[PDB]
UniProtKB/Swiss-Prot annotation, chain B:
Chain sites annotated for binding deinoxanthin: 184
Keyword terms: Cell outer membrane, Copper, Ion transport, Iron, Lipid-binding, Membrane, Porin, Signal, Transmembrane, Transmembrane beta strand, Transport
Protein name: Outer membrane protein SlpA
Periplasmic side, ranges: 53-56, 91-102, 134-139, 178-179, 212-232, 329-330, 361-364, 406-410, 503-511, 551-552, 586-594, 629-635, 685-686, 729
Molecular function as annotated in GO: lipid binding; porin activity
Assembly and oligomerization: Homotrimer. Part of a heterooligomeric complex resulting in the main assembly named S-layer deinoxanthin-binding complex (SDBC) which is composed of six different subunits, namely SlpA, DR_2310, DR_0505, DR_A0283, DR_A0282, and DR_A0281.
KO phenotype (gene knockout): Deletion causes substantial alterations in cell envelope structure, and a significant defect in resistance to solvent and shear stresses. Mutants shed exterior layers of the cellular envelope. Deletion mutants show a significant decrease of the UV resistance, especially under desiccation conditions. Deletions mutants show large disruptions in the OM, but the S-layer is unchanged compared to wild-type cells.
Keyword Iron-sulfur: no
Function: Plays an important role in the structural organization and integrity of the cell envelope, bridging the outer membrane to the peptidoglyan layer. Is a highly abundant molecule in the D.radiodurans cell envelope but is not a fundamental component of the S-layer. Binds the carotenoid deinoxanthin, a strong protective antioxidant specific of this bacterium, and could be part of the first lane of defense against UV radiation, especially under desiccation. Appears to be a nonselective channel.
Gene from which the chain derives: slpA
Residue numbers on the Extracellular membrane side: 1-33, 63-81, 112-123, 151-163, 193-200, 245-315, 342-350, 377-393, 423-493, 523-538, 565-576, 609-614, 649-670, 701-715
TM annotation in the entry: 34-52, 57-62, 82-90, 103-111, 124-133, 140-150, 164-177, 180-192, 201-211, 233-244, 316-328, 331-341, 351-360, 365-376, 394-405, 411-422, 494-502, 512-522, 539-550, 553-564, 577-585, 595-608, 615-628, 636-648, 671-684, 687-700, 716-728
Curated annotation (Swiss-Prot), chain C:
Subunit: Homotrimer. Part of a heterooligomeric complex resulting in the main assembly named S-layer deinoxanthin-binding complex (SDBC) which is composed of six different subunits, namely SlpA, DR_2310, DR_0505, DR_A0283, DR_A0282, and DR_A0281.
Binding site for Cu(2+) 1: 30, 32, 61, 64, 66
Residue ranges crossing the lipid bilayer per the database entry: 11-24
Descriptive protein name: Outer membrane protein SlpA
Organism (species): Deinococcus radiodurans (strain ATCC 13939 / DSM 20539 / JCM 16871 / CCUG 27074 / LMG 4051 / NBRC 15346 / NCIMB 9279 / VKM B-1422 / R1)
Length: 195, 729, 145, 48
C-alpha cells in the first residue's frame, strides 16, 4: 500500500525577514522539486546512515532489521486474529538544492554543491560542484551606454565540501572569485577573472 | 517508563529509540536518495473533567479534582487533590426556599489517583459536604464537613506519615450585609496521626474580620467597609479582627494542599495569604525562631554569607487589631492597633504595633504627622547596629512630619524630618522592623485626597540606592527604567528637602520633562553603636529625563547625580554621574536612498570610596547605524551598525538560576573592558546577508591583555556570516 | 458531501528551511549587551544572538555567547572576563581513568581532588585545557518537514 | 472547494502480487544464451 500526494506542492514563496529592517516579503517564487508521500514498509536497501557521509558503510543498519515488520520474511509483526501491522514511513526526495532570487540584471543563487565555471584552467568546477555557498550574476545587457557589448559579472563564494570532518581536504577551506566579460564584436567574448 | 510524566534519569531520548526520527546522528536513507521517517500520531488532551446535568444537579467526573469549600478546610484548588467526582446541587428555584439561593456541594476522590507505595497518596480517600445560603443581601453562611483517611490497604503498606484519619467541621459567614462586611471562619482538626496508640489531636482555627475582601480573596485594607458618614464627618472603620489559630493547624489539620504559615516572616507576618501556592488564609500560624547551635557548642551557627540559621517552632496566633480613620474637613486623622500573641497566650511572643497619623491640607499646602510603634517580644531576625544578623526582642519608635507644596505648574517641593528610634539608640535606620505588621497605613499628600492607605511611605521623598543596571552605562541608556523614579524603600533617621517636576501633569513648564533635585542629611551614630551621634551624613541627588520629538528624530536625554558621604543601603560613598542620549530618526522621504539614522551615547562615572579603596569606576557606551531603505536595485536594503563599550573597574554578574537576572556592577578588578563591533546587514529581495565582526579585550593596568585566555596578549575575536532566506509553501 | 469530506480531511503542511551560516571565534563572548534597548526593555534584534530568554531562571540574551554553534553561558569572576566571556575551565585527569573539570584561571587552586583519586600526570602536569575556540564550518543546510 | 480538497488529498494505491513457482536444479547453469537476440541486441524475454 502506498499513499501518494497530489503533487501540487512545487512552489515556495519567500517571506519577510531581516533584523535591522524588515523586507516586503512574498517577492520571489521558487520552483521546488520535492517528491514526497507515505510508504508502508522499507525497501531492501534502506539503511540508517550514522555517519553523515550519505553512503552505506560496513554494517550500518539494514533498515528492515531496525524497524521489525517493515518488510521481508524474517520479521512479520502480526496478530493471532490474522491481522498484519506494518510501520508507516514518510518518504521524500529533494532534488532542488539551488534557490535563485532577482529578476533582470542581478540573480543571486544560494545552495549546496555550487556548480560554476569561470574558464578552463581556473574554475572548471562543474559536473560535481565545489562547495556550499552563493553565486551572484550581474547582466548589464540593458544599460543604455553599454548594452551592445553585453557585459557580465560573475561572483562566487563558498566553503569547500560544505560541512566536513577533520582530515578531509575541505575542512575550513573557503573559495571566492569574480569574472567580468564582454563581447565587443560579433561573437568574441573577452573575459578577465580572479579566483 | 515510570508513569510519573517527567523525564527521569536517562529515560530514552526518544529520537534515539526511533532511529531516523530527527537529528543528524541517524538518518534512515535509500541509495537512490530517498529518506524515510516514521509517522507518529501526536495528540494533546487538556480536558480531564466531564459534567453531567443542567440546572439543579451537576456531577463532575475527572482527574485531579479541583475543589474548594472554604479557606482552612479544602483550599484544594490550584493543583487538585485526586481523582474522583464532585456533585453540586443548586436550589435557586425551589418554590418555598429559592430566594436564599441554597447550594449543596459533595466531593469524593482518591488522593493523587493511583500511585505507588511510599507516596503520600497511597490508599487515601477524601469525602466532603458543604451547605450554603444567603439569608440577607450578600452574606453567604455555610457549614461544611470534610474527612480524609486511609482504607484497609493504606493502614498497612503505605509508610509515609499521612495521618490515619482527619475530620474537619467548619462554618463561614463571608459577605456584605447592611453596609458592613463580615468575614468569619471556624474549624476543627481531629487528626489521628497513624503510629500505634493514635492519641487523637484537636486544633481549631477561628477568625472574625470586618474588612473589604477583593475577588481574589485578598483583603483590601484601603476601602473602609463601614463608612459612618459623608465627606465632612466621615469616620470610617477599615479593619477590626480577631484571631484564634491554634498551634496545631497546618495544611494537614485542615485538609488542604499548602499554607497556614507566615508568608514572609519579614513582611506582614500575621497574614498567611500566599498568592504563589494559592493559599487564601487571612491569618497565619506564627512560629518561634531561635539560634541553631548544632555541631559546634558555644556559638550560634551561621550560614556561609553570615546570615543566622534559625530553628522554627509553631506557636499559633491569638490577637486582635483595629484600623480606622476619621475624615474631618481640611484635616484628617487615622490610627491602627494590633497585638499578636501566641495561641497559648504567653507574653513571651507578643508583638504589639500601634500608630496613628494626621494630615492637614488646604489650597496648595499639606502637612502630615505620623507616629509608629512596634514592641515585639517575638525573636525577629534583623541586623544589629554593627551589621550582623541577630535574633531577639525589638522595640521601634518612629515619628515623621512632612510638608508638601504643589504650586500647580506640575512642580512640587517637599521637606521631611523622619526620626527612627530602635531599642532606645537613635538607629540611623530601622532594620526593616516597622514592616512586620499588616497595618502601617500612612496618609497621602494633596487636598481632597484623605485616604488612609496601608504601607508606610518610607519610600517617599527620598533618594535612590540602586547599584545594578541592565546596560553597561549606569541605567541611563535604558528607555524602560525611569531613573528619576528610583527610591530607596528604607526608612532613615534623616531630614531634608526635595524639589521636583512632572511632565504628565498638564500646565507644566516643559511638556514631557521630569527632574528630581534634592538634598538630605542622614543621622549616623558616633562610632558604631553609641547612643550619641550627629546628622553628619549628606546626600545630594538629582535626575532628569526629557523625550521630545524635535523633527523626524526622537531625542531622549536622561541624567543622574549623587554625592553621598555614607554607606546608605548598598551604595558606596562617592560621586556618581551618568548621562545618556538616544537618537532615533525615521525614514527621510526627501534625501535619496531614504536613509534612517540612529544613535546612542552613554557616559557613567562613579568614585567609590569603599572601606578598602577609593577606586574610580566609569564606563562609556556608544552606538551608531544607518539603514538605507532604497539602494540601487528595487527591493534592496543595506544597513550598517557600529557599537562599542569601554569600561574601567566594572563587572557583570550573570543570572543566578532563579528569578533574579544578571546585572552590571562596580568591582575593584583592575581591568578595562573594551568590547567593540561592526555589523553589516544587506538585503536583496528577501535574501538577507548578515556579516558581523566583534572584538573583546580586557587589559589590566599594566596592559597585559588577558582576553583570549591562552595568555598570548591578543583580544578575543568573533566573526559571523549568515545568508538567511525564509520560504513558505 | 463536501462538508463531510472536509470534516475528516488532512491539511498537509510542508515546511522548508534554507540557510547558510559560518562562524569563527576564539573565546565565545557575548554581544547582545551592545545593541540598543527597545522601549519595553528588550534588546534589539540581530542575526547573531544565541537566544536564551527565560523567565523561570531569569536568563536573558546577554547571558550567553553568540559565536559558533555554542551558547556557552558567560562566567563571572576572573575565569570569564569578569562576566563578558566564557570561563577557562581546565580539565583534571585521575588515576582510575576518570576525569573531572576544574573551573578557574589557576589549576593549582584545585582544592577538591576526591579522596580516592590522584592526578595522573597526563596533561601539562595532569591538568589539561578545555579549548576555548568555537567553529562552525561554512555550510548551507536545507531542512524539510 | 473540490479543488482545495484535491490539493491536499491522498491517492491511496494498493498492489497485489500473485504467483506460484517451483524450480529444481542440480548445478544452476545459465539458459539466457540460448534465446534469440533481438534487433537491438537484447535477449528475448523469457519466464526463467
Amino acid at each position: 500500500l502506498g499513499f501518494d500526494t497530489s503533487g501540487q506542492f512545487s512552489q515556495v514563496t519567500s517571506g519577510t525577514g531581516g533584523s535591522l529592517f524588515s523586507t516586503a516579503g512574498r517577492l520571489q517564487v521558487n520552483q521546488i522539486d520535492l517528491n514526497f508521500g507515505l510508504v508502508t514498509g522499507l525497501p531492501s536497501d534502506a539503511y540508517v546512515d550514522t555517519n553523515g557521509n550519505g553512503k552505506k558503510d560496513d554494517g550500518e543498519a539494514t533498515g528492515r532489521g531496525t524497524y521489525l515488520g517493515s518488510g521481508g520474511t524474517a520479521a512479520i509483526l502480526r496478530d493471532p486474529a490474522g491481522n498484519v501491522y506494518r510501520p508507516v514511513f514518510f518518504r521524500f526526495k529533494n532534488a532542488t538544492t539551488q534557490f535563485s532570487v532577482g529578476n533582470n540584471p542581478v540573480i543571486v543563487t544560494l545552495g549546496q554543491q555550487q556548480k560554476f565555471y569561470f574558464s578552463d584552467y581556473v574554475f572548471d568546477n562543474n559536473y560535481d560542484g565545489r562547495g556550499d555557498g552563493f553565486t551572484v550574476t550581474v547582466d548589464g545587457s540593458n544599460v543604455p551606454v553599454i548594452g551592445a557589448w553585453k557585459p557580465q559579472i560573475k561572483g562566487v563564494y563558498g566553503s569547500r565540501s560544505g560541512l566536513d570532518g577533520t582530515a578531509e581536504a575541505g575542512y575550513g577551506v573557503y573559495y571566492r572569485g569574480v569574472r567580468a566579460q564582454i563581447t565587443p564584436v560579433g561573437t568574441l567574448t573577452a573575459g578577465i577573472h580572479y579566483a | 517508563t515510570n508513569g510519573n510524566g517527567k523525564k527521569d534519569d536517562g529515560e530514552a531520548t526518544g529520537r534515539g529509540t526511533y532511529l531516523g526520527s530527527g537529528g543528524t546522528a541517524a538518518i534512515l536513507r535509500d541509495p537512490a536518495g530517498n529518506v524515510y521517517r516514521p509517522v507518529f500520531f501526536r495528540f494533546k488532551n487538556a480536558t480531564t473533567q466531564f459534567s453531567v446535568g443542567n440546572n439543579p444537579v451537576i456531577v463532575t467526573l475527572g482527574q485531579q479534582q479541583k475543589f474548594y469549600f472554604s479557606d482552612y478546610v479544602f483550599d484544594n484548588n490550584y493543583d487538585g487533590r485526586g481523582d474522583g467526582f464532585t456533585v453540586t446541587v443548586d436550589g435557586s428555584n425551589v418554590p418555598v426556599i429559592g430566594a436564599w439561593k441554597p447550594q449543596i456541594k459533595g466531593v469524593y476522590g482518591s488522593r493523587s489517583g493511583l500511585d505507588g507505595t511510599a507516596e503520600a497518596g497511597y490508599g487515601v480517600y477524601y469525602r466532603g459536604v458543604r451547605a450554603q445560603i444567603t439569608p440577607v443581601g450578600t452574606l453567604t453562611a455555610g457549614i461544611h464537613y470534610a474527612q480524609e483517611g486511609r482504607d484497609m490497604f493504606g493502614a498497612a503498606q503505605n509508610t509515609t506519615s499521612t495521618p490515619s484519619d482527619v475530620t474537619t467541621y467548619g462554618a463561614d459567614l463571608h459577605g456584605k450585609a447592611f453596609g458592613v462586611e463580615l468575614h468569619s471562619e471556624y474549624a476543627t482538626s481531629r487528626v489521628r496521626p497513624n503510629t500505634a496508640n493514635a492519641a487523637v489531636q484537636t486544633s481549631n482555627a477561628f477568625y472574625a474580620r470586618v474588612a473589604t475582601r477583593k475577588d481574589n480573596l485578598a483583603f483590601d485594607l484601603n476601602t473602609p467597609a463601614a463608612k459612618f458618614g459623608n465627606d465632612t464627618f466621615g469616620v470610617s472603620l477599615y479593619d477590626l479582627n480577631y484571631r484564634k489559630i491554634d498551634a496545631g493547624y497546618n495544611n494537614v489539620a485542615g485538609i488542604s494542599e499548602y499554607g497556614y504559615g507566615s508568608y514572609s516572616r519579614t513582611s506582614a507576618q500575621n497574614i498567611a495569604y500566599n498568592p504563589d501556592t494559592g493559599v487564601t488564609a487571612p491569618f497565619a500560624n506564627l512560629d518561634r525562631q531561635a539560634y541553631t547551635d548544632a555541631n559546634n557548642d558555644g556559638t550560634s551557627d551561621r550560614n556561609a554569607d553570615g546570615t543566622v540559621v534559625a530553628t522554627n517552632t509553631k506557636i499559633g496566633q491569638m490577637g486582635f487589631g483595629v484600623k480606622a480613620a476619621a475624615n474631618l474637613g481640611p484635616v484628617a486623622i487615622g490610627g491602627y492597633y494590633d497585638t499578636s500573641t501566641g495561641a497559648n497566650g504567653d507574653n513571651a511572643n507578643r508583638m504589639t504595633e500601634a500608630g496613628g497619623s494626621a494630615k492637614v491640607a488646604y489650597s496648595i499646602f499639606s502637612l502630615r504627622g505620623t507616629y509608629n510603634t512596634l514592641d515585639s517580644n517575638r525573636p525577629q531576625i534583623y541586623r544589629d547596629a554593627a551589621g550582623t544578623q541577630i535574633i531577639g526582642d525589638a522595640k521601634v519608635r518612629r515619628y515623621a512630619v512632612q510638608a508638601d507644596v504643589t504650586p500647580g505648574l506640575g512642580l512640587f517641593v517637599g521637606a521631611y524630618y523622619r526620626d527612627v528610634n530602635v531599642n532606645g539608640v537613635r538607629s540611623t535606620t530601622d532594620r526593616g522592623l516597622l514592616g512586620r505588621g499588616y497595618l502601617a497605613s500612612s496618609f497621602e499628600p494633596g487636598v481632597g485626597n484623605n485616604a488612609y492607605r496601608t504601607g508606610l511611605r518610607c519610600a517617599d521623598n527620598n533618594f535612590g540606592t540602586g547599584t545594578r543596571d541592565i546596560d553597561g552605562v549606569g541605567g541611563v541608556l535604558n528607555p524602560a527604567v525611569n531613573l528619576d523614579q528610583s527610591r530607596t524603600a528604607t526608612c532613615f533617621t534623616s531630614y531634608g528637602v526635595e524639589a521636583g517636576h512632572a511632565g504628565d501633569n498638564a500646565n507644566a513648564l516643559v511638556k514631557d520633562l521630569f527632574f528630581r533635585v534634592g538634598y538630605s542629611r542622614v543621622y549616623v551614630p558616633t562610632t558604631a553603636t553609641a547612643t550619641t551621634g550627629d546628622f553628619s551624613g549628606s546626600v545630594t541627588y538629582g535626575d532628569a529625563r526629557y523625550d521630545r520629538k524635535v523633527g523626524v528624530a526622537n531625542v531622549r536625554l536622561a541624567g543622574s547625580f549623587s554625592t553621598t558621604n555614607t554607606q546608605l543601603d548598598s551604595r558606596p560613598a562617592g560621586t556618581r554621574g551618568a548621562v545618556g542620549l538616544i537618537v532615533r530618526t525615521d525614514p527621510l522621504e526627501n534625501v535619496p536612498f531614504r536613509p534612517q539614522f540612529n544613535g546612542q551615547v552613554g557616559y557613567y562615572t562613579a568614585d567609590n570610596r569603599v572601606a578598602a579603596g577609593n577606586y574610580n569606576a566609569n564606563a562609556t557606551k556608544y552606538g551608531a547605524g544607518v539603514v538605507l531603505n532604497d539602494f540601487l536595485l528595487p527591493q534592496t536594503k543595506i544597513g550598517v551598525r557600529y557599537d562599542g563599550y569601554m569600561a574601567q573597574n566594572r563587572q557583570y554578574t550573570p543570572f543566578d538560576g532563579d528569578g533574579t537576572q544578571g546585572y552590571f556592577s562596580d568591582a575593584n578588578n583592575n581591568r578595562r573592558t573594551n568590547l567593540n563591533g561592526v555589523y553589516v546587514e544587506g538585503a536583496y529581495q528577501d535574501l538577507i546577508f548578515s556579516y558581523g565582526t566583534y572584538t573583546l579585550s580586557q587589559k589590566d593596568l599594566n596592559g597585559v591583555e588577558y582576553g583570549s585566555g591562552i595568555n598570548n596578549g591578543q583580544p578575543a575575536r568573533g566573526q559571523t556570516f549568515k545568508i538567511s532566506y525564509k520560504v513558505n509553501f | 458531501r463536501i462538508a463531510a469530506l472536509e470534516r475528516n480531511a488532512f491539511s498537509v503542511k510542508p515546511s522548508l528551511t534554507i540557510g547558510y551560516s559560518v562562524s569563527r571565534t576564539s573565546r565565545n563572548f557575548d554581544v547582545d549587551r551592545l545593541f540598543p534597548l527597545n522601549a519595553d526593555g528588550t534588546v534589539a534584534n540581530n542575526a547573531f544572538t544565541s537566544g536564551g530568554i527565560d523567565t523561570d531562571t531569569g536568563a536573558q540574551r546577554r547571558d550567553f555567547g553568540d559565536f559558533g554553534n555554542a551558547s556557552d553561558p558567560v562566567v563571572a569572576g576572573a575565569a570569564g572576563l569578569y562576566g563578558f566571556a566564557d570561563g577557562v575551565s581546565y580539565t583534571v585527569y585521575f588515576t582510575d581513568g576518570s576525569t573531572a573539570t576544574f573551573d578557574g584561571l589557576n589549576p593549582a587552586d584545585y582544592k577538591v581532588p576526591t579522596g580516592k583519586v590522584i592526578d595522573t600526570t597526563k596533561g601539562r602536569n595532569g591538568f589539561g585545557f578545555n579549548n576555548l575556540a568555537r567553529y562552525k564550518e561554512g555550510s548551507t543546510d536545507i531542512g524539510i518537514s
